[PDB]
Design a protein around this ligand. Structure first.
Ligand code: VZC
Lengths: 300, 237
């Protein structure tokens, strides 16, 4: 179990850690989060009480270093930092725990939700999507645009998701225009899986990361990416059986976790109706279809 | 975006553009089988690709052999249309390629966009104009070349005959739309109007009769009457 200490909490803020969240008052004696499960990536996120504009946060893996949060009164935000003095860090953490100034990561033992949402998400792949190689953790916020959005503005502050575009020369072989547009198996299996992602785990990891950025930061370009990666699979007549079964599980847990009140803005009616009811895979996503029809029958 | 009543002089500016109509590509007769079921028999069709400024018509004849052993023919027909338009564009010298292609039916947008991905600078646009180009097969010489075809074939026509010697393209295209709309609304009446006077003939190299300017004014009035007439007989007015 690892710890992310906080130097202090000078401004009132709602703090998220993965799917959990809690409020900290201005100058409340709060010194961080303990008992963080080792073995998963995690996200710590922030919404200031005085400006619920700009949610922002940091993806990190406690196995890659000792990380802490410190408010910066010049830049006006809670910053993640790495402490290289491991003795200093262990000392600080021990003092804050003995004083009980930390919230405990509140995982129930029956609960695999976070694993199920991050199963294929790797810190190394996050750092390729979010380029800032001087840090081992990755900053994301609500406003960051994707490389595809920048094509359709600061490159250093962008989400470098894999560009998926169904009406593109990459997606469509000459002489197979109708075939490849109506059945995207070529684009999924040869271009994307074999060529770019190399395996389905990396594809699923990007899909999972895009969903989590959409949900935690309301990041629009991430939502676009998540839906495009679902639609590419659902619009392909030839998909490995194990990928379809895994996708059904991935989407089930995403739909299960989604705040009921955000479904109207985080779920694309067209993509989901197409995927569940018209596409090649309309009968292959049994768990996802059942939770969607029972939780969000309006959308359908 | 879409072409409508606001931007119609755009059709007659000096940016090369083509209309594409696919309504006569896939044509069938429906009949009863010996067992009393129903079946279709395809007949030859055509893509109607028209430059509205010059009158040049690229009539790609679609021979029924292209459907042999294919499924979902109404869907295939849109993609075959887009394939042939793409081939036509590729066949033209760069300075003759269109800057825009306007499809008469929105279902042609994705097929054509996908076939034209190599030409990112050619705009593919719909129109809110309900253009009567389906009636092109009511022009006798076009119907004849389509039905006589025994293989795929492209035939070039000027659908304005020599009218541009005397009138603008805007006026020629308005006249063509009036004629085709009439032929679509009441083909028999329209053809009697066009052909009732035996002293006015169709030249061998033309599609329509050799009306004088004053005769065109008369013909055009008779076509408006017809479209109004049938509109009464239809809506009881
Ligand atoms: C429909 N029509 C006509 O019948 C013209 C005549 N007669 C028209 C004319 C200009 C632009 C668009 C349509």
């Amino acid at each position: 179990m690892n710890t992310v200490p906080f130097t202090s909490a000078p401004i009132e803020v709602t703090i998220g850690i993965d799917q959990y969240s809690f409020n900290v008052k201005e100058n409340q004696p709060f010194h961080g989060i303990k008992d963080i499960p080792i073995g998963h990536v995690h996200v710590i996120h922030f919404q200031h009480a005085d400006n619920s504009s700009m949610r922002y946060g940091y993806w990190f893996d406690c196995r890659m270093g000792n990380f802490y949060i410190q408010y910066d009164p010049k830049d006006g935000l809670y910053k993640m930092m790495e402490e290289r003095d491991g003795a200093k860090f262990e000392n600080i953490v021990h003092n804050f725990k003995e004083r009980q100034m930390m919230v405990s990561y509140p995982k129930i033992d029956e609960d695999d939700t976070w694993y199920n949402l991050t199963e294929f998400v790797q810190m190394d792949k996050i750092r390729k999507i979010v380029r800032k190689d001087e840090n081992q953790f990755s900053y994301v916020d609500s406003s960051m645009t994707t490389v595809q959005e920048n094509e359709l503005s600061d490159p250093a502050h962008s989400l470098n998701y894999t560009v998926i575009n169904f009406k593109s020369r990459e997606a469509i072989r000459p002489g197979h225009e109708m075939e490849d547009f109506l059945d995207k198996s070529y684009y999924l299996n040869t271009v994307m899986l074999q060529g770019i992602f190399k395996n389905s785990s990396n594809y699923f990891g990007e899909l999972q990361f895009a969903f989590l950025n959409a949900m935690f930061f309301g990041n629009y370009g991430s939502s676009l990416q998540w839906h495009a990666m679902i639609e590419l699979i659902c619009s392909s007549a030839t998909v490995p059986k194990h990928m379809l079964d895994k996708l059904d599980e991935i989407l089930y847990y995403q739909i299960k976790t989604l705040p009921e009140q955000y479904s109207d803005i985080l779920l694309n009616e067209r993509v989901w109706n197409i995927c569940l009811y018209s596409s090649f895979q309309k009968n292959s996503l049994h768990n996802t279809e059942k939770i969607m029809e029972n939780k969000y029958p309006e959308l359908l | 975006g879409a072409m409508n009543s606001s931007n119609y002089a755009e059709l007659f500016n000096n940016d090369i553009k083509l209309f594409v109509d696919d309504t006569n590509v896939y044509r069938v007769t429906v009949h009863k089988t010996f067992e009393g079921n129903v079946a279709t028999k395809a007949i030859n069709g055509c893509i109607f690709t028209l430059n509205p400024k010059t009158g040049h018509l690229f009539l790609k004849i679609i021979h029924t052999s292209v459907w042999a052993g294919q499924k979902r023919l109404s869907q295939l027909a849109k993609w075959k249309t887009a394939e042939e338009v793409s081939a036509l564009v590729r066949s033209l010298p760069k300075e003759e390629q269109p800057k825009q292609i306007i499809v008469t039916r929105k279902a042609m947008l994705d097929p054509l966009e996908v076939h034209m991905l190599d030409f990112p600078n050619i705009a593919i646009r719909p129109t809110e104009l309900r253009l009567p180009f389906s009636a092109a097969m009511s022009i006798d010489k076009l119907s004849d070349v389509v039905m006589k075809a025994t293989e795929p074939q492209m035939v070039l026509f000027n659908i304005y005959d020599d009218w541009l010697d005397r009138i603008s393209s805007y006026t020629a295209f308005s006249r063509l739309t009036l004629l085709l709309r009439a032929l679509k609304t009441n083909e028999e009446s329209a053809k009697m109007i066009l052909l009732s006077d035996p002293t006015i003939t169709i030249k061998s190299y033309h599609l329509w009769p050799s009306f004088t300017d004053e005769q065109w004014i008369t013909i055009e009035s008779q076509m408006r009457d017809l479209i109004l007439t049938e509109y009464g007989r239809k809506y009881n007015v």
